[PDB]
Amino acid sequence: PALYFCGSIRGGREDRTLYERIVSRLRRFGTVLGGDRLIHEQDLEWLQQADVVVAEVTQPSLGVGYELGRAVAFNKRILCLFRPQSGRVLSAMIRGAADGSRFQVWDYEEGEVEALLDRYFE
C-alpha cells in the first residue's frame, strides 16, 4: 500500500521532528513515496500513485493544502492530523472537506501519534 506524506516546509519547519516520527511509523504499513516545476511534477506523479495520503496539518502551508486539494480530485483516501496544543484553529477548508470516512481529520496529542496511526492502519 503506497503512502504519501504531507507536511510544511516553506510554510515553516517547526514540526520537522514530528514529521519524521510519523513517516517512521508509516513505513511499517506501506511504501512511503528542474527547480520547483520538477518538484511539483514529481509530487503529482506520486500523489496519483498513492493509496493513502497522510498530512500533518498543524503548521499552515500552501503546499500541504495544495497536495490535499489535488488528492481529493485524484480520488485518494486522506488522513489529516492536527494538534490543538498549537493553539491554532484549523482551516475551515480542511476541517470542512472531511467526510469522516475517505477524508478524515483527527485532532491528536503529540505523544499519541504512533497509537493513532496504528489504529487507522488497523
Site residues for a copy of itself per CB under 8 A: 8-12, 35-41, 43, 57, 60-74, 88-98
- Using CB under 6 A as the binding rule, whether residue 62 contacts ligand A1BBC is answered as yes
> Can you give 67-105 as a three-state secondary structure string?
HHHHHHHCCCEEEEEECHHHCCCCCHHHHHHCCCCCEEE
Indicate the SS3 state at residue 31.
strand
Please compute, for residue 87, the number of CA atoms within 13 A of its CA located in the half-sphere on the CB side. 0
Measured CA to CA, the distance from residue 88 to residue 56 in angstroms comes to 13
Q: Is 96 annotated as a binding residue?
A: no
Task: Work out what residue 37 binds among a copy of itself, ligand A1BBC, none; the CB cut-off runs from 5 to 8 Å by kind.
Answer: a copy of itself
Task: Work out what residue 84 binds among ligand A1BBC, a copy of itself, none; the CB cut-off runs from 5 to 8 Å by kind.
Answer: none
Region 10-29 residues binding ligand A1BBC, contact defined as CB under 6 A = 10-11
Measured CA to CA, the distance from residue 98 to residue 102 in angstroms comes to 8
- Using CB under 6 A as the binding rule, whether residue 61 contacts ligand A1BBC is answered as yes
Per the annotation, where are the binding residues for 5-hydroxymethyl-dUMP? 7, 9-11, 61, 63, 67, 91
